[PDB]
Design a binder for this molecule. Sequence first.
Ligand SMILES: Nc1nc2c(ncn2[C@@H]2O[C@H](COP(=O)(O)OP(=O)(O)CP(=O)(O)O)[C@@H](O)[C@H]2O)c(=O)[nH]1
Lengths: 23, 192, 136, 37, 126, 133, 426
Amino acid sequence: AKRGRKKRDRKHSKANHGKRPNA
Amino acid sequence: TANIPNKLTANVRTRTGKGASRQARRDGKVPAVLYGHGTDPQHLELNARDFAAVLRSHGTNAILTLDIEGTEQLALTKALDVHPIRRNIQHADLLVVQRGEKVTVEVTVLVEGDATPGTLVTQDANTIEIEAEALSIPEQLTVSVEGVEAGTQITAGQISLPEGVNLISDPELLVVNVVEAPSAEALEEEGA
Amino acid sequence: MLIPRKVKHRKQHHPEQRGIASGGTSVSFGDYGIQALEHAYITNRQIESARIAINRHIKRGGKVWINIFPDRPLTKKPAETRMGSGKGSPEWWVANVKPGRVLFELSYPDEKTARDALTRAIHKLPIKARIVTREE
Amino acid sequence: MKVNPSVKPICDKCRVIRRHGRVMVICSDPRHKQRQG
Amino acid sequence: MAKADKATAVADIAEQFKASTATVVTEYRGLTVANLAELRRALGDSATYTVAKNTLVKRAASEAGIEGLDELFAGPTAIAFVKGEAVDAAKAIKKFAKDNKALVIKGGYMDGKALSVADVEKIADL
Amino acid sequence: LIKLQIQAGQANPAPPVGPALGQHGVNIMEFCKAYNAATESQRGNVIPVEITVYEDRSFTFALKTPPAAKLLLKAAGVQKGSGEPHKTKVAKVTWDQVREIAETKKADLNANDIDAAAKIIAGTARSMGITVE
Amino acid sequence: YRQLRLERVVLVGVWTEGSAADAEASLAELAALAETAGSEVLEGLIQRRDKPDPSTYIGSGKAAELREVVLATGADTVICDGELSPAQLNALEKAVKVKVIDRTALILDIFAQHATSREGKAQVSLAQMEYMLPRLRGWGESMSRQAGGRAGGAGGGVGTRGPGETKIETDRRRIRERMAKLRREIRDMKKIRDTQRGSRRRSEIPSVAIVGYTNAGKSSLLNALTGAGVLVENALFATLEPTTRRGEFEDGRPFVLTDTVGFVRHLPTQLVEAFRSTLEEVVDADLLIHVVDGSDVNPLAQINAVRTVINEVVAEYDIAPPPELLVVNKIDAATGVGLAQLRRALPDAVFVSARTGDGLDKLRSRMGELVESTDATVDVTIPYDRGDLVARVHTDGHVDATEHTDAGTRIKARVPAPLAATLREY
RNA sequence: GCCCCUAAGCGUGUGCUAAGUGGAAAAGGAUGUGCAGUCGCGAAGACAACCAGGAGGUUGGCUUAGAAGCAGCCACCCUU
Ligand SMILES: Nc1nc2c(ncn2[C@@H]2O[C@H](COP(=O)(O)OP(=O)(O)CP(=O)(O)O)[C@@H](O)[C@H]2O)c(=O)[nH]1
């Protein structure tokens, strides 16, 4: 389950501010 | 029992609140109030390391001469606010007292001997309410279970009190009862 | 295991775990305690396993106090069923714990084996813990 | 060796050491040679 | 180390310097007790085989004030007593320089002054 | 060099003393001659023997004696004891030969010290509970 | 493994053959087994049918009689003292309208709870699973109304319907497959037993074992005859794994004494398959200890049933059956005045009581007697320069060490081949 | 966001990291390395070192093939 973890651990960037859509 | 008031200092606090108290506790201070019969609601700022140095050595009922903007006032530590998981000190009540006054406190009691070695000794309540003079408040009243058979109740009448100290709580509540020591069958048959 | 004799409401909501424990946060009966540091749904069998793991290491002496009681049931919808048509039957019995809440208490003479037995108890619980005493 | 994620001393004759990035137990009795990874 | 108990003991051990006039100084080299039990039990009549391991023969002798010597720490130095029985324990341990063979002659406290080795043998005779 | 605390009423009856005569390249019963001529002529109140052969094949003893714990084994009473420490009393000892409690051996294992009597008043005594009253 | 609630049971059983007393004897084990699983037993009806019915085990009307009794006592269960097919136990369910779960299922389940070691758990799931393979359509809820089908079969083209197989096949394949993984897993565990018994294999030692049906003792005889305290619960199947301890008589060779699981009558031929541990032992022994209770109505019965299982073992492994000693226990505390009968014609009817009353003196002295031949005997002249001749001469297992002299030692003892060996120089 | 791709800082001052940590993760294991107090000894030269020190009645019991300081263990009031 690498793909879901990499897709929803992208919200921890400074340009997303802790939140992303569908994650 | 005649002890010496622990010298200290405490400046009066400018601004009260939640954020101001948190900012004060972020700098090494402890907030406090100094109510009592003198009618001095005094919003103070103690120091944490000195206050814990007084507390963890001279008991919890520690008399404090304290310099509040240039005046030494004797004050007894009434109640404390300790955080349950950080175990620091978050507040302090300092009841203003003067000498000669009989005041009521709650001291902790301890045990001395071992037992008879075939029994288990269990504390029940390690607090005793007593009425003593302000510069006479004792600490760590000692109870002795030394070669004492099981079936024993040491209630709150058999404690020996020092000079001038009267009781408050009745002499019918248990302090140390000594029950006969169980075995492995009584450990497996108690709690299932 | 430890089960209640009867309960008023058989199917209940999940007990919300938020905030710090405002009652229990001191050692009251015994000499050494186990103070929780995280939230958990500590169940029936975990309490039984920790009590067994204490009594295996203190063989004959001292009391042991279980301060918490599992009386909050959790249900479980049965096997391979789609989602719908009723809350399931009550399966698990759970006690709710918060940080600070002292779980187990122990009196024993030997101070080394007391902390040994309490670490043996701590290793069966689903959270982190501590060995606090009845003094400061 | 008995390699597993939890090395710790067994007897009163063995030490732990940190060597080449791995933490390992070394003993005079060679049954107790453990290393982590 | 703690100077309280050690100083108040060994300063009086070296204050027995001030009361007496003769104690003999030997060397300890370590053996069984089972071969030194006969030594201290038989020919130490009222005397000792004490270490003073390398400890306090010059610093804790200032209450005597007659410490006009340097070699009180030099090598190992013993404190066997011949105050009451002068020639007895002295030559009774000097025979263990041919029996025990784990000591030599150093010399020591005779009359409070520093005597030569040849003449302390001459007065251990005379 | 093997010492002992085995029983002392022996005339080569058993594997303890018989093979002790029959070891190390000596005569068969020449130490047995002197042993049953001297020691158990003094009725044999417990006597160990440490092997101190010279080149001329001889080794002599003293009046060997248990310490102040089990002096009663030599002097007064029964030949028994217990097995745990600090246990029940078995017999009692008076104070006649209590300057003779030290008249057997005043040694230590190490190089450390002396006065095995002031040792023996509580050293090798609390291991069983054999008493002096 | 399944765990719910009962405690309300009405037991039933066809008396196809056997004496009257013999018949209710079976129903009785069922009571003890039922209670050993912990459930109150209410009534209990037995019929006399020369052979069961292919639809309802007991009958048609008898099923009707049971229907009312289940409404009377409200018993939530019914257990049948026999092995019953999937069909019979499904029809009898619409009749009485309650649990109609047979005996083999009681025993298989007791083994689930009472068994601890991981190995023991695995063998159980095999059994329970092999018992549930032949019951899938019957538990046909997964196929209950699985009529959602009717898939078109134009075929020779798109169907996109994936099932390229019937659902029963696909489902059967899964249970059969899991059963196969476990099968290889269990056979591997064999190497762990063998390796945990390498020391005993080598250094040949004696090896008495204790066979016997359940509740006959066995683990009482061991806890007393040697030392040690193993579960000695008064219930059924209290030992679900073999134990071994050391002990000896004059011949200190270990007389290693093993304790085993219990052989009830009519094994469920399932969980027992994997209970090979007890049987691996029976094969590799120097004696057996059939323990039988005198507090039993007819002791001779269990003697034969148990002996039968021992029969099959010797048959497969082609072995000369080991010497076997049958020791009666529960005597003395003998809740049995029918004691004399056995004594009239029973070998070694020692009044072993194992509890108070001992009785173990004669057995111990008569135990080493049947064990396999010793093989050490020797008399020699040892020089005084021993210090070594003691090799094991005195310090050995059975080394006699029973003769002496002044000259070294005219020892006259016994010595094994690898110990004093040939070294001894007369 | 500012070394080059790629516009703008291989920016300035004080510290940390040796893991490419930075640039995924748990119960738990652990002689990493900075900080801050505490506790005895505490630049007495304590501590480490070269080292005399080797069967005290030391083959004790509980017992004896011996119970060969020493299968096991329930105690170290012990001293030039
Ligand atoms: N009254 C009495 N009971 C005895 C005596 N000897 C043994 N028992 C009974 O036998 C039981 C012990 O044997 P047990 O451990 O049950 O044998 P087991 O075969 O291992 C039981 P399992 O079926 O689990 O293997 C005890 O419950 C005890 O009541 C006796 O002399 N008198």
